[PDB]
Amino acid sequence: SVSSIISHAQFDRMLLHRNDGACQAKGFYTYDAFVAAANAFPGFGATGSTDARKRDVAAFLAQTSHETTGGWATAPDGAFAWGYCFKQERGAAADYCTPSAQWPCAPGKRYYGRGPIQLSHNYNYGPAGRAIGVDLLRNPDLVATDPTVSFKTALWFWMTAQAPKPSSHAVITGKWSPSGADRAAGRAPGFGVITNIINGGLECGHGQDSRVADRIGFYKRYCDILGVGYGDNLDCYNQRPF
Ligand SMILES: [Zn+2]
Ligand SMILES: [Zn+2]
Ligand SMILES: [Zn+2]
Ligand SMILES: [Zn+2]
């Protein structure tokens, strides 16, 4: 039903050049896979006012677009037209396997970044796999070979809280109630705190940051496409990291 918020046409206008020959993931990410994945997380794009629902979709696609961007300053249609260009960590990467009796690593497998949110480590592939009913510890490559599974891992991240961090979904739909600690840290509801949730240790609270700006660029472009206002507190330049 997320299709009632974002049409196939709008989805492609947003992720405009993802299938250009220069992109590693060309041909991978499809609108039908996105819609199928969304069906497994009913609340996504279906919680709150029509505007909250549009921002929920735009923010999700904007943050994931930054994580997989292939854009550059003078890119065709701007740097914010190049999200979803990659589907797996570039380079030699690493094993990303840490001791865990709850989410044991499978021999010979590696848990490097895969998919829209660049899911990493066995302790994340484990709970994400359980959430979607797929054994991602034994078959982590499915996050880079099956687009529906790929999108599902990203939505799992979007919809899952990591207390004290709320889920990004809760923040964008206006369901997050900041603690006294959050208020003291300057973490107010908005797109900015979502960036903080995702990679605040490295990007937030130290003034202007090009990574934060790139995330906002995607968000504003996508909100413009769906026809919704951005909401407040878009940056995390002055927010203490979670
Ligand atoms: Zn299409
Ligand atoms: Zn193109
Ligand atoms: Zn690690
Ligand atoms: Zn810093």
UniProtKB/Swiss-Prot annotation:
It comes from the Eukaryota. Optimum pH is about 5.0. Stable between pH 4-8. It catalyses: Random endo-hydrolysis of N-acetyl-beta-D-glucosaminide (1->4)-beta-linkages in chitin and chitodextrins. Pfam families: Glyco_hydro_19. Keywords: Antimicrobial, Carbohydrate metabolism, Chitin degradation, Chitin-binding, Disulfide bond, Fungicide, Glycosidase, Hydrolase, Plant defense, Polysaccharide degradation, Signal. SUPFAM superfamilies: Lysozyme-like. One of its GO terms (cellular component) is extracellular region. This is Basic endochitinase C.
